[PDB]
Amino acid sequence: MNAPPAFESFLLFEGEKKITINKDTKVPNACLFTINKEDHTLGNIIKSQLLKDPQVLFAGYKVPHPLEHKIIIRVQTTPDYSPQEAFTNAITDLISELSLLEERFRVAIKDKQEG
């Protein structure tokens, strides 16, 4: 009667942007990234990778409503740095980490099956 289709958690609606960047006016060098059709899976890793950047002053995320299917990630960096650049570098670092983890898991599987 009121059950949303299960794909609405993963699929973007037509004309709906995957990610939107909005300047935070309260403090300088801060941005809000509203990412649609993602959840804690990417939010937590992006936040925790951003916390590894010493040029990042704030890194947090929230799912504003569990029934809704977006996350907001707030990133504040030092003045010489940018929150967009920080977010990009965090994603790049996560991708490199996962590539290395995948190659090493392939090697470990090969060793385990062989000996």
Instruction: Render 49-85 in DSSP notation, one character per residue.
Output: HHHT-TTEEEEEEE-S-TTS-EEEEEEEE-TTS-HHH
Alpha-carbon distance values, 44 to 3, 4, 72, 86 (Å): 27, 25, 11, 15
From the list 29, 49, 59, 74, which residue makes contact with another protein (rule: CB under 8 A)? 49
CB of residue 23 to another protein, shortest distance in Å: 10
From the list 15, 26, 79, 111, which residue makes contact with another protein (rule: CB under 8 A)? 111
Rule CB under 8 A: say whether 13 interacts with another protein: no
Rule CB under 8 A: say whether 75 interacts with another protein: no
Phi, psi of 15 (to 5 degrees): 75, 10
24 vs 93, beta carbon nearer another protein: 93
From the list 29, 47, 75, 76, which residue makes contact with another protein (rule: CB under 8 A)? 47
Spatial contact of 96 and 108, defined as CB atoms under 8 Å apart: no
Strand partners, 31: 23, 75
Which residues of the chain form contacts with another protein (CB under 8 A)?
A: 3, 6-7, 9-11, 17-21, 35, 38-42, 44-45, 47-49, 52-55, 66-67, 84, 87-89, 91-102, 104-109, 111-113
